[PDB]
Amino acid sequence: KWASLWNWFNITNWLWYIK
């Protein structure tokens, strides 16, 4: 399936807040 893109897609939410 395509359930292998959100695992990181959600990372660009907090990581973007970090850097």
Swiss-Prot record:
Subcellular location: Virion membrane; Host cell membrane; Host endosome membrane
Ranges for region MPER: 1-19
Membrane topology: Single-pass type I membrane protein
Top-level taxonomic group: Viruses
Carbohydrate attachment residues: N10
Subunit: The mature envelope protein (Env) consists of a homotrimer of non-covalently associated gp120-gp41 heterodimers. The resulting complex protrudes from the virus surface as a spike. There seems to be as few as 10 spikes on the average virion.
Function according to Swiss-Prot or TrEMBL: Acts as a class I viral fusion protein. Under the current model, the protein has at least 3 conformational states: pre-fusion native state, pre-hairpin intermediate state, and post-fusion hairpin state. During fusion of viral and target intracellular membranes, the coiled coil regions (heptad repeats) assume a trimer-of-hairpins structure, positioning the fusion peptide in close proximity to the C-terminal region of the ectodomain. The formation of this structure appears to drive apposition and subsequent fusion of viral and target cell membranes.
The protein's name in its UniProt record: Transmembrane protein gp41
Lineage, top ranks: Viruses, Riboviria, Pararnavirae, Artverviricota, Revtraviricetes
The gene coding this protein: env
Range covered out of full length: 665 to 683 of 856
